[PDB]
Amino acid sequence: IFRSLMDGDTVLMNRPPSIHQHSLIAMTVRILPTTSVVSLNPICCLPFRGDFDGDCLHGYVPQSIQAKVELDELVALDKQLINRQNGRNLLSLGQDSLTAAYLVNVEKNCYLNRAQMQQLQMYCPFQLPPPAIIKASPSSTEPQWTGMQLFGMLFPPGFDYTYPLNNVVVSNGELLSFSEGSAWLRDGEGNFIERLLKHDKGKVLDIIYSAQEMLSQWLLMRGLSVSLADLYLSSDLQSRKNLTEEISYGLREAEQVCNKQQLMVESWRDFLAVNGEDKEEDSVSDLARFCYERQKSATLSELAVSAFKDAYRDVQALAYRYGDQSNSFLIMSKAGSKGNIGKLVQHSMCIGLQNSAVSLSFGFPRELTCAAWNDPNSPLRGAKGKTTTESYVPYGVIENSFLTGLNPLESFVHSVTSRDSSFS
Amino acid sequence: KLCGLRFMKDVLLGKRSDHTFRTVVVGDPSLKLNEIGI
Amino acid sequence: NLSELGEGFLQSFCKKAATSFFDKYGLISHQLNSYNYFIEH
Amino acid sequence: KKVSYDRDTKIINAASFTVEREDHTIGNIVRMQLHRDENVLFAGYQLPHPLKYKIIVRIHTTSQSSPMQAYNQAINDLDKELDYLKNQFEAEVA
Amino acid sequence: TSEKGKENCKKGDCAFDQGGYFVIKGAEKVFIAQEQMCTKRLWISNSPWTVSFRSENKRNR
Amino acid sequence: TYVCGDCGQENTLKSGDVIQCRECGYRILYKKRTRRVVQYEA
Amino acid sequence: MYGDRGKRNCWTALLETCLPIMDMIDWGRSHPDNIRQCCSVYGIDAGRSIFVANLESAVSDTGKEILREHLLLVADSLSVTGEFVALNAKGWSKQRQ
Amino acid sequence: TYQRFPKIKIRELKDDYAKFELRETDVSMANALRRVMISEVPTVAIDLVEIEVNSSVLNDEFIAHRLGLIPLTSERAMSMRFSRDCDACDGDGQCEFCSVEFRLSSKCVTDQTLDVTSRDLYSADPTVTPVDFHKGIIIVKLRRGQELKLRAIARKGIGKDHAKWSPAATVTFMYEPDIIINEDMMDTLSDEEKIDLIESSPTKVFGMDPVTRQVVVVDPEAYTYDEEVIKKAEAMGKPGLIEISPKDDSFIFTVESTGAVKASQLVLNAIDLLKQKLDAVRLSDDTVEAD
Amino acid sequence: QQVLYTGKVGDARYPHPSHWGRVCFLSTPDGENCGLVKNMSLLGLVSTQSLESVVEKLFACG
Amino acid sequence: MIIPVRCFTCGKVIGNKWDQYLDLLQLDYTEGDALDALQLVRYCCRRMLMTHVDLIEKLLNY
Amino acid sequence: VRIFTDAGRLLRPLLVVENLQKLKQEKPSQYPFDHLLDHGILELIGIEEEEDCNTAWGIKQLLKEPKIYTHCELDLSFLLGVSCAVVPFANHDHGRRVLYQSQKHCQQAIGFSSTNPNIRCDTLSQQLFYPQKPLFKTLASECLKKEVLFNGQNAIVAVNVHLGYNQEDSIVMNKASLERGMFRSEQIRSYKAEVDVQFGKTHDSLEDDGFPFIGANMSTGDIVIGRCHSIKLKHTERGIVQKVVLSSNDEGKNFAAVSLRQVRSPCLGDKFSSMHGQKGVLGYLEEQQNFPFTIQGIVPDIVINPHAFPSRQTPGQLLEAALSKGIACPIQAYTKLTRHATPFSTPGVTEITEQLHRAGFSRWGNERVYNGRSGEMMRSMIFMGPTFYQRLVHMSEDKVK
RNA sequence: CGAGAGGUA
């Protein structure tokens, strides 16, 4: 009495390690013509915390009828719609429907005609809204639809949503207003997915599936790519030169701010007081001694790191000025799909601060040039000119970025800093 | 190696069962969220 | 002279010197030398 | 049955044609030909599953002609266009 | 195989390895460079503070 | 039928103890491929 | 303060040093930063409250959002017998004893 | 409401190369024609082999795979039937409607290296002789000895599977853009900026006229739809200087064949196959509607 | 590099300035033995024992 | 390793253009001029004709 | 003064400029390394001696400020290993990905196995049908003059989304390109048995000597070596018999080796890797008629998800693609063309853009594409370039349990 | 049956 596996049966899927109860999800078996591989919806990768790069999923097949009955009533996907860790939604659009929704809600200038709208309606559960755009030119027929009405076909007619932070107003299933922010689409306290789940909780999965299909079709119609113009982060050569000079001056100002902040100790209380001191020039004449004094202490190093980050936030804030609206990296950073602003800064303008949090027997020469490596008195050569030293906390700033290339000393510094990163 | 606490883990705590499969997983947006492609 | 050799000539000489070094010693020479020294002496 | 006729009860004058063993090369041209007719309101096709070779075509018409009539008229017009193009190519080659 | 002539190029090795291995039981064995401390340099350690003189051949530390 | 190594000669020996090539001295033999029709899908 | 390995607690010694300056230090809020000796100085409830606050701070620093009920349940489960036992086998054995 | 009336004009026509212009039609029709001619036009190719002597340095499977990709003349591809539907046949060996037998035999008895090309591949039917372009397609190289004897058959197949029955070679089509020049904002630009604007175009689309000292349009069908001149004009301060828009009812085709069938015959076969598919769909729809 | 209890390597895991031109400071085996195994550079040579005596030559220099 | 036939991405038969390419390279011609003389306008076929390595010679020798 | 002459010291050659002017004499010649060492043009410097002398990095800095650069380096890319110096734009990529590429992906690549497989009976010998050398050139590779440093094939790779089938660092390849012979490799597995019982059939594919004939398709439950017991193939053992080797030692113990070969076509779950730490598994096989073809009809063989770049932080693969496209595309003067991709001597981005512009394409590497399903023209250009990829030894059918 | 080294998630 043993029949072969077919459609409708439930299996208990799991991905090692099982770090939380949502790794056990009961799914219905669907037969596919493929072989030696299993497939699932990419949105469902979040509960498993797994990618698609060689990750293997091992499943369990119940045999007794009672185990099958209790499997889809407690361990099924529709029963795990609420995350038990924080009370929010468990399933969310992973970076793809997210990117497509951000693009379709931010542009507001790429109208869709009747044919494309009807083609995209096949993947939406609800009907078609009015075009709302009858004429856009004095000699333009064929009234078109707007981008924000395309996303409004995913909401039920009786669904009301309001997100004041992003100025999002949803009334009668229609998206009325949206300014910016890309926060109501990601996972959060007031995301639209959570409100939909709290509204009906009966067809949320179908809505998510239809939205994923429609947004994938729309993105295929548009197309997203990354080219060298995204990494260049400039319109022409003059803009690139201006950006390079601005980055250099910002790094110099950040270093000066760090050196100024390093003087907030008890040894300089006589200098910090409002009096007459003749040693004002000596505090700025010794520029190379500040690095050695910083790398030999821990509290000073932490204060320097904090000051450098505070002064480098403004430096990172230049990509929005020197970047275009159609920048793929900027779009993916604003939408919260993949990456952040700092990664773009390291890609285009400058890597920034590179420091290790372990005690080593060598330091950084603060210059990262050919002359700095050949200096006998540099901190990299064991001791910074002797009174001797025994340990150092490395602290260096790389002016170059990953696009313009890295010097061998800069690559050595980056490797030393990044050696501390390891899962195992 | 099978001694002490490792013996307990390999015998009583951790066990191997039948009717199981293990394969590599790929992406397929055509399937539903609650469906697995076998 | 001082700078009459040129820049490209030095690059070509560096490439030729690297080629000669790879032709003489090769990628595996240290192990061979260590084993030969253990037999002869 | 290669092509199946299914009627929609919620929407008047609506039909869903499921064509088996088809691809985009036929659905796209059928959809583009259906838009030329004035009586066709909604015309589109989709391929929900690449592994299952099926094409679903949805046709909405007014209260003047049936969706099947519009589908047949579009097919006949496309065949006539193909014949005209073949004749033009034959005349051009010689 | 060392200093082989032109007749050995058509029969024998595949001309893809320099031959830095050993054949023990049909398997290739490779030695890895073992990094050891220098025995010809004065070594100074801390906790406790001491200076040691390494032994060259016999234990005369 | 078995082909020898550096020596060109067919041993054609099926005995359990016969593993050494005749008049050659080496004990390495390669099985010869006969004329058999095999089909492949291109 | 240096770790007093004797029977005298560091809090009691700190109270003796601050005799000349008592009104300036608010003793209605001053508490040891440690969790175990706080339960002996002020009581098990104060130690539990400080433990909950530290757990919330650690969760916030970890970058994750955890509901209050889980942390409260952990705090109440780790202080059933009026003493914060360790997570090793000795603490579990003592709690069961 | 009714059918369209496309226009076809042929610019260049050769045995394996054809470039014709299609006008008064939609993009979908051209895309479907391209897909049919690149994936649905059937040809003849070697799919099953039978090796009995093989002592070369290459594996038998590699030789079979490289033999199955040799182009063959497919003038009878439309009339031939598929092996799956050949009722009055077995499936293996020389057939009358589905399979054609091929024989190959090579033996090297000289000191020099013998190259087994595709010219010494004989078949029973003279109408299926492989296309000869030259020395032929190299199959294997033989040293002194190393005989190779092979027997293979060829069947009719669609180009959808194995990508070896497809006769098309990157069949393309464009929209034939029309270049619009204001001819009034160019007078503001000096002679130095005109050279910079000309050099901005990756291809030779805009030329400098010496007698009139202005820019003209030469070979308009080489713009490649790359936003280079428009971006340069916007950077220089002229936003609406050059406006380029793709034409929807005009197309320029470029059909390249692998030598199996002629390009004009390839287009005719693609049209016939599309018509047959439409007729089958119409018959299915009529059967569903009538009953 | 032979280190007892490779689980806690300590300092001998990170690249050193003495690794300039001798061993690769950018390619190390990720895992438990990270930093212990070091790949030699292309221009890497290992000195052997000298057979001749340099005492007389050194005394001849002054 | 003989030349990859049929230009995997392009679809053009390029199996008979290796001897001609070698003959052109033997004369005073560069890779670009030799590829242009063989009428290869797409860079896919040029890459296929340029990235191929002749390995069958060593197979026949050794 | 500290002098060392013992063994175990690591040395490297460096250029000395004190007698570098002596080089310019009898210009056309191939310099032996021994001649240069004897004449003092080059010397070996230890780790302790290097910290005392001043050494310049490049040769351009030497000509700027001489007399302070008594020592000089030949090439900065030689500081890395043999598996790391061959990687283009090594300093442009992140350290973690360059480490992965130099450690794991180089070892797991499938390339040249050997030219004499008849004398080797090693287990799991994998070989690719059509190995291809990379379009870009590296100084280390040029000096070594070995094509075995690169194991893989290069394909036209486009950075775009394809119906969401390439999500979660997945890869979508072209069905038509794989069926023509791309990324097709063979696997030869050898089975060994020792006899001191004798070889025999003792009562389908076995011959009278106890071994199957060459050319027999072996499956599960079949005997590969017969002894009289016999050794049978397991559940995941299959292939075609290639050769049978019999050998014995001086002790009289006979040995038998049988090799089985099978062509490993790219399956749906196969894992592939790049030269910049980009690793992912195949997600979907798409027909050639459904790809976003360009104006000239070149369809992308591999489509990768754009979301991997902003997170993995691997810039240089795009630079490699642009350089390869510029090299491959025709010019409508091929001499003096930028082809080298030395890690520490990479050409500037402006040079790459100019080279690609002179070839007739866009300066940023992106080209206008047309949808293969509907025929409409996409709004945004897609970046395409022939990057060099690798195939890893991990297969989908080797993980089924 | 164990033991030793590498690798995958």
Ligand SMILES: */O=C1\[N]C([N])=NC2=C1N=[C]N2[C]1O[C]([C]OP([O])(=O)OP([O])(=O)OP([O])([O])=O)[C]([O])[C]1[O]
């Ligand atoms: O030691 C481990 N213990 C454990 N429970 N899991 C684990 C351990 N080591 C590795 N893992 C698993 O590996 C992945 C790491 O993710 P990875 O490298 O496969 O993908 P990404 O996205 O992180 O990196 P890239 O390749 O750049 O895309 C962990 O999730 C873990 O489960």
Ligand SMILES: [Mg+2]
């Ligand atoms: Mg990943």
Ligand SMILES: [Mg+2]
């Ligand atoms: Mg993973």
Ligand SMILES: [Zn+2]
């Ligand atoms: Zn012999």
Ligand SMILES: [Zn+2]
């Ligand atoms: Zn027949």
